[PDB]
Motif scaffolding. Structure first.
Motif, PDB file in Angstrom:
ATOM      1  N   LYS A 296      -2.968   7.023   4.106  1.00  0.00           N
ATOM      2  CA  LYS A 296      -1.966   7.637   4.980  1.00  0.00           C
ATOM      3  C   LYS A 296      -2.612   8.416   6.118  1.00  0.00           C
ATOM      4  O   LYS A 296      -2.312   8.173   7.295  1.00  0.00           O
ATOM      5  CB  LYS A 296      -1.055   8.540   4.147  1.00  0.00           C
ATOM      6  CG  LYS A 296      -0.318   9.632   4.912  1.00  0.00           C
ATOM      7  CD  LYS A 296       0.781   9.077   5.791  1.00  0.00           C
ATOM      8  CE  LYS A 296       1.732  10.173   6.236  1.00  0.00           C
ATOM      9  NZ  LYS A 296       1.007  11.294   6.896  1.00  0.00           N
ATOM     10  N   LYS A 297      -3.529   9.331   5.781  1.00  0.00           N
ATOM     11  CA  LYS A 297      -4.330  10.010   6.797  1.00  0.00           C
ATOM     12  C   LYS A 297      -5.069   8.998   7.658  1.00  0.00           C
ATOM     13  O   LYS A 297      -4.953   9.016   8.892  1.00  0.00           O
ATOM     14  CB  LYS A 297      -5.314  10.972   6.135  1.00  0.00           C
ATOM     15  CG  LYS A 297      -6.117  11.801   7.123  1.00  0.00           C
ATOM     16  CD  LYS A 297      -7.327  12.435   6.461  1.00  0.00           C
ATOM     17  CE  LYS A 297      -8.408  11.401   6.193  1.00  0.00           C
ATOM     18  NZ  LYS A 297      -9.743  12.030   6.005  1.00  0.00           N
ATOM     19  N   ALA A 298      -5.780   8.064   7.009  1.00  0.00           N
ATOM     20  CA  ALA A 298      -6.466   6.992   7.724  1.00  0.00           C
ATOM     21  C   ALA A 298      -5.495   6.220   8.603  1.00  0.00           C
ATOM     22  O   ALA A 298      -5.843   5.831   9.727  1.00  0.00           O
ATOM     23  CB  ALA A 298      -7.159   6.056   6.736  1.00  0.00           C
ATOM     24  N   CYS A 299      -4.252   6.059   8.124  1.00  0.00           N
ATOM     25  CA  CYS A 299      -3.215   5.374   8.888  1.00  0.00           C
ATOM     26  C   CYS A 299      -3.016   6.040  10.241  1.00  0.00           C
ATOM     27  O   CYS A 299      -3.124   5.381  11.285  1.00  0.00           O
ATOM     28  CB  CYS A 299      -1.911   5.345   8.092  1.00  0.00           C
ATOM     29  SG  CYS A 299      -0.564   4.453   8.892  1.00  0.00           S
TER      30      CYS A 299
ATOM     31  N   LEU B  25       0.819  -1.212   0.000  1.00  0.00           N
ATOM     32  CA  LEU B  25       0.000   0.000   0.000  1.00  0.00           C
ATOM     33  C   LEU B  25       0.853   1.262   0.000  1.00  0.00           C
ATOM     34  O   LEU B  25       0.450   2.272  -0.589  1.00  0.00           O
ATOM     35  CB  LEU B  25      -0.964   0.059   1.188  1.00  0.00           C
ATOM     36  CG  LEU B  25      -2.288  -0.712   1.232  1.00  0.00           C
ATOM     37  CD1 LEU B  25      -2.142  -2.200   1.438  1.00  0.00           C
ATOM     38  CD2 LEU B  25      -3.198  -0.104   2.276  1.00  0.00           C
ATOM     39  N   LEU B  26       2.006   1.233   0.674  1.00  0.00           N
ATOM     40  CA  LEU B  26       2.842   2.426   0.779  1.00  0.00           C
ATOM     41  C   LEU B  26       3.379   2.841  -0.587  1.00  0.00           C
ATOM     42  O   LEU B  26       3.348   4.023  -0.948  1.00  0.00           O
ATOM     43  CB  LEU B  26       3.988   2.184   1.759  1.00  0.00           C
ATOM     44  CG  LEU B  26       4.815   3.432   2.077  1.00  0.00           C
ATOM     45  CD1 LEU B  26       3.944   4.487   2.739  1.00  0.00           C
ATOM     46  CD2 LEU B  26       6.002   3.092   2.959  1.00  0.00           C
ATOM     47  N   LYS B  27       3.877   1.874  -1.359  1.00  0.00           N
ATOM     48  CA  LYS B  27       4.442   2.181  -2.668  1.00  0.00           C
ATOM     49  C   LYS B  27       3.353   2.484  -3.692  1.00  0.00           C
ATOM     50  O   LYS B  27       3.625   3.186  -4.673  1.00  0.00           O
ATOM     51  CB  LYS B  27       5.342   1.010  -3.103  1.00  0.00           C
ATOM     52  CG  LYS B  27       6.180   1.165  -4.390  1.00  0.00           C
ATOM     53  CD  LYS B  27       5.461   0.733  -5.669  1.00  0.00           C
ATOM     54  CE  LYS B  27       6.421   0.664  -6.844  1.00  0.00           C
ATOM     55  NZ  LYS B  27       5.778   0.074  -8.050  1.00  0.00           N
TER      56      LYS B  27
ATOM     57  N   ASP C  15       2.594   9.501  -5.586  1.00  0.00           N
ATOM     58  CA  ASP C  15       2.298  10.922  -5.491  1.00  0.00           C
ATOM     59  C   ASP C  15       1.420  11.188  -4.270  1.00  0.00           C
ATOM     60  O   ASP C  15       1.281  10.343  -3.380  1.00  0.00           O
ATOM     61  CB  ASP C  15       1.630  11.421  -6.770  1.00  0.00           C
ATOM     62  CG  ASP C  15       2.517  11.287  -7.986  1.00  0.00           C
ATOM     63  OD1 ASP C  15       3.744  11.470  -7.850  1.00  0.00           O
ATOM     64  OD2 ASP C  15       1.985  11.000  -9.078  1.00  0.00           O
ATOM     65  N   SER C  16       0.840  12.388  -4.205  1.00  0.00           N
ATOM     66  CA  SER C  16      -0.074  12.760  -3.132  1.00  0.00           C
ATOM     67  C   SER C  16      -1.319  11.881  -3.133  1.00  0.00           C
ATOM     68  O   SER C  16      -1.522  11.086  -2.209  1.00  0.00           O
ATOM     69  CB  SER C  16      -0.467  14.233  -3.251  1.00  0.00           C
ATOM     70  OG  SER C  16      -1.521  14.404  -4.183  1.00  0.00           O
ATOM     71  N   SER C  17      -2.123  11.997  -4.198  1.00  0.00           N
ATOM     72  CA  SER C  17      -3.399  11.280  -4.375  1.00  0.00           C
ATOM     73  C   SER C  17      -4.316  11.404  -3.158  1.00  0.00           C
ATOM     74  O   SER C  17      -5.005  10.445  -2.799  1.00  0.00           O
ATOM     75  CB  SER C  17      -3.176   9.803  -4.724  1.00  0.00           C
ATOM     76  OG  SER C  17      -2.356   9.144  -3.776  1.00  0.00           O
ATOM     77  N   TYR C  18      -4.269  12.574  -2.496  1.00  0.00           N
ATOM     78  CA  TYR C  18      -4.954  12.931  -1.248  1.00  0.00           C
ATOM     79  C   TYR C  18      -4.404  12.179  -0.029  1.00  0.00           C
ATOM     80  O   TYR C  18      -4.743  12.521   1.109  1.00  0.00           O
ATOM     81  CB  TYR C  18      -6.480  12.739  -1.395  1.00  0.00           C
ATOM     82  CG  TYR C  18      -7.318  13.111  -0.190  1.00  0.00           C
ATOM     83  CD1 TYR C  18      -7.567  14.441   0.128  1.00  0.00           C
ATOM     84  CD2 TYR C  18      -7.859  12.127   0.631  1.00  0.00           C
ATOM     85  CE1 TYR C  18      -8.330  14.781   1.231  1.00  0.00           C
ATOM     86  CE2 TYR C  18      -8.622  12.457   1.734  1.00  0.00           C
ATOM     87  CZ  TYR C  18      -8.855  13.784   2.030  1.00  0.00           C
ATOM     88  OH  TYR C  18      -9.616  14.114   3.128  1.00  0.00           O
TER      89      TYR C  18
END
Length: 200
Positions: free
Chosen positions: A176-179, A163-165, A169-172
């Motif tokens: 990551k935020k949910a992380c 999921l990290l890779k 780009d940003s893509s919102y």
DNA sequence: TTGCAGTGCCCACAGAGGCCAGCAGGGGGCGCTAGTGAGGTGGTTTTTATATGTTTTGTTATGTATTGTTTATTTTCCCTTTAATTTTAGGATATGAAAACAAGAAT
């Protein structure tokens, strides 16, 4: 098999006659891929139309995940993903939820479809509402990682790196935020744990 | 009759006081006017007020552009089946190279 699978999908109340039971089991263990995906598709359509009375056959279903095919594993992932998404609180979910992350590294296509499958399943933004859904999501994740200890942890962290890779780009930054929306909540869980040590 | 002691009378010049014009004191009533002071009327403007025309503001309707929706033709991922295509012997070829023979040359 595909056609009569559609037939029994129309009428689930026929899957009791013994000779066709022998036939569908033999096609589960037939020496060819296509019959195997047809039979598992039959069983999965029975499971989705009739959630009950199929858990006795769930052991065969879960042993059909590993079939050295290409489309058979995609089909059984679709089946089990829909089982997970339609009925919670089934007694053998989390153990179930172990086995397919064990196959995330197997092929490139399986890697993908499992990754967005779980991302829609678990790692969604989840705005500031519905605390209980987040709560038993956390509970399910803890049960998964607790059942993960006996075999090995490398598969799930490999999934995490997948999921990290996937979002270079940003893509919102949706996971990551949910992380972080997860981790402090886990800290919050610890903040409310306060006392059972297996869950800790 | 006279001298002396005392009286009578006539005048006259002050002496006196009423008569009189002159003149100054206080206050009553009129002839006339300069100079304001105020009040009333007329003119002027002016200022408020009112009404009309123009323009600005607000509201309404139409057209264009944007977002969404179920098709719908790619398209693409995944099978089982051939159609070149490759690899491994197995036989045959060829071209070489010694080997033998025959031909000069010498001894």
């Amino acid at each position: 098999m595909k056609c009569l699978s559609e037939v029994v999908a129309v009428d689930p109340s026929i899957l009791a006659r013994l000779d066709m039971q022998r036939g569908v089991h033999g096609r589960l263990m037939d020496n060819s891929t296509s019959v195997r995906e047809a039979a598992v598709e039959l069983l999965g359509r029975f499971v989705l139309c009739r959630p009950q009375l199929a858990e006795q056959y769930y052991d065969m279903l879960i042993e059909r995940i590993l079939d050295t095919g290409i489309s058979v594993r995609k089909r059984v992932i679709k089946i089990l993903r829909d089982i997970c998404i339609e009925q919670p609180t089934f007694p053998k979910i989390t153990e179930m939820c172990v086995k397919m992350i064990r196959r995330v590294n197997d092929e490139e296509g399986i890697k993908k479809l499992v990754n967005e499958t779980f991302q829609k399943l678990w790692f969604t933004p989840t705005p500031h509402n519905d605390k209980e859904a987040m709560t038993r999501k956390i509970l399910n994740i803890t049960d998964v990682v607790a059942a993960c200890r006996d075999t090995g942890y490398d598969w799930f962290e490999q999934l995490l790196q997948n999921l990290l890779k996937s979002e270079e780009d940003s893509s919102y930054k949706p996971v990551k935020k949910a992380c972080t929306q997860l981790v402090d909540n886990l800290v919050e869980h610890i903040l409310k744990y306060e006392e059972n040590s297996g869950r800790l």
